[PDB]
């Protein structure tokens, strides 16, 4: 999200360059039911309620570099030989050790 608040896809290189966290917004469908002991029930559902952002492992199914051909990766300034499997957290490539 830019300063003006305009959302835009975040490329992994931009996260690396601008020291961003490669995170995906997380939404959850929430159903709220209220009973006021008046033999009436009101059920209101808030579709896609923002609840946080999950850091995304690069070159995973939820990464923007998913299914992109090697030529496409080069267009994004990404090394095709790069295996992915890490996170960009404040621009730092973080690997989770088993």
Q: Interface with another protein by CB under 8 A: which residues?
A: 1-8, 14, 17-19, 23, 25-26, 30, 32, 34, 46, 49-54, 57, 71, 74-75, 77, 85, 96, 98
Integer Cα distance of 74 and 62 in angstroms: 19
Shortest Cβ distance from residue 53 to another protein (Å)?
5
- Least CB distance to another protein at residue 29 (A): 11
CB of 44 to another protein, least distance (A): 9
H/E segment holding residue 38:
none
Closest by CA to 85, choosing from 24, 27, 17, 22, is: 22
């Amino acid at each position: 999200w830019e300063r003006d608040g305009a959302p835009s896809p975040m490329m992994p290189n931009e996260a690396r360059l601008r020291n961003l966290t490669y995170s995906a917004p997380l939404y959850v469908d929430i159903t709220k039911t209220v009973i006021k002991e008046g033999e009436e029930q009101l059920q209101t559902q808030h579709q896609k309620t923002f609840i946080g952002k999950i850091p995304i492992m690069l070159r995973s199914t939820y990464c923007l570099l998913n299914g992109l051909t090697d030529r496409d990766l080069c267009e994004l300034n990404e090394c095709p030989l790069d295996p992915g499997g890490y996170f960009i957290i404040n621009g730092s490539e973080k690997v989770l050790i088993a």
